[PDB]
Amino acid sequence: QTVPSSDGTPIAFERSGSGPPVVLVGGALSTRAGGAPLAERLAPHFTVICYDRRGRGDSGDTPPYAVEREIEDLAAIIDAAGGAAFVFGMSSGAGLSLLAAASGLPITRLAVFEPPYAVDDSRPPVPPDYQTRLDALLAEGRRGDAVTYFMTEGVGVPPDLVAQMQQAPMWPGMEAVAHTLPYDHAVMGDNTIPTARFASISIPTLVMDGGASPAWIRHTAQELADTIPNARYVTLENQTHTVAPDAIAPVLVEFFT
Ligand SMILES: [Cl-]
């Protein structure tokens, strides 16, 4: 189904399961499909809502883009969930979720995985021309190259892993929503943490990283779990690069219940 955001944009979503509501918020290049495997593991415990962020999947889009519009989208989805919910945010979706929490949305418990803020030099510098170059690639219709650029220069993934992603079934779906990469850049700002705002988040919070996280992601996670007063920091037990639903779900079930 869809629900209208404040600006009229139809936001597509699906519900499954039973129990208290959980909203899954996806990151860069995600659509609602991305959360489906996790949602299915959570469904025995929670009513889970997965949704397409604006400009993706079955959702519409209403220019001009503003981060506030995506906070309003999430507000509409939390309303679809009943008016308040637990939230799990992934990657840049964790940034959006933290901003939404700081803005006063009715998020009752918050879990975030690998929010891609930067707190130290162990993260490679993002090129100063990142926004300009990303826009240029998109304007030429080089969607694949835009994704490659985001992964290598935006979030510091080594070229070998990115080339492997290009061979995976995931890649065409990412290309299809590459025009939203500037939206995630806007959500994340310059990757610095808005400490004053996040320190004001009072709800129970869980910050997670994975066994293959780069050092800079660990440091960010540690700092967020210190800045947010009621936060814990968990490193997941994934045994390869890919974090599977069963590495995340039990931790979420424990934290949310
Ligand atoms: Cl391309």
Q: Strand 231-235 relative to strand 205-209: parallel, antiparallel, unpaired?
A: parallel
How far, CA to CA in Å, does 159 sit from each of 74, 132, 152? Answer: 33, 21, 7
Note whether 156 and 124 are within 8 A (CB). yes
Other CB atoms within 10 A of residue 253 CB:
15
**What would you report as the CA-atom Rg of the chain, rounded to the nearest whole angstrom?**
17
How far is 51 from 47, CA to CA, in rounded Å? 13
- Given resolution (angstroms): 1.4
How far is 132 from 41, CA to CA, in rounded Å? 40
State the CATH class of domain 1-257: alpha beta
Instruction: Locate 11 and state its tokens.
Output: 């936001």
Amino acid in position 195: T
Q: How far is the CA of 27 from the centre of ligand 1 (A)?
A: 21
Note whether 154 and 126 are within 8 A (CB). yes
3 state SS of 148: helix
* Method used to solve the structure: X-ray
Residues 6+ apart with CB under 8 A from 169: none
Full DSSP string of 201-242: --S-EEEEE-TT--HHHHHHHHHHHHHSTTEEEEE---SSSS
Tell me if the bond preceding 116 is cis, omega within 30° of 0: no
What is the torsion angle, in degrees rounded to the nearest 10, for the CA atoms of residue 195, residue 216, residue 231 and residue 100?
Answer: 50
Q: How far is the CA of 179 from the centre of ligand 1 (A)?
A: 12
Q: How far is the CA of 174 from the centre of ligand 1 (A)?
A: 11
How far is 156 from 85, CA to CA, in rounded Å? 32
Domain ranges for the chain, please list them. 1-257
How far, CA to CA in Å, does 240 sit from each of 117, 161, 214, 222, 237? Answer: 23, 13, 13, 22, 9
92 marked ligand binding residue? yes
- Which of these, 239, 91, 242, lies nearest to 161 by C-alpha position? 242
Q: How far is the CA of 243 from the centre of ligand 1 (A)?
A: 27
User: Ion ligand 1 — residues with CB under 5 Å?
Assistant: 142, 144-145
Q: How far is the CA of 148 from the centre of ligand 1 (A)?
A: 8
28 marked ligand binding residue? yes
How far is 82 from 197, CA to CA, in rounded Å? 26
How far is 87 from 110, CA to CA, in rounded Å? 5
How far is 38 from 193, CA to CA, in rounded Å? 27
Residues 6+ apart with CB under 8 A from 68: none
Q: How far is the CA of 127 from the centre of ligand 1 (A)?
A: 19
Note whether 87 and 42 are within 8 A (CB). no
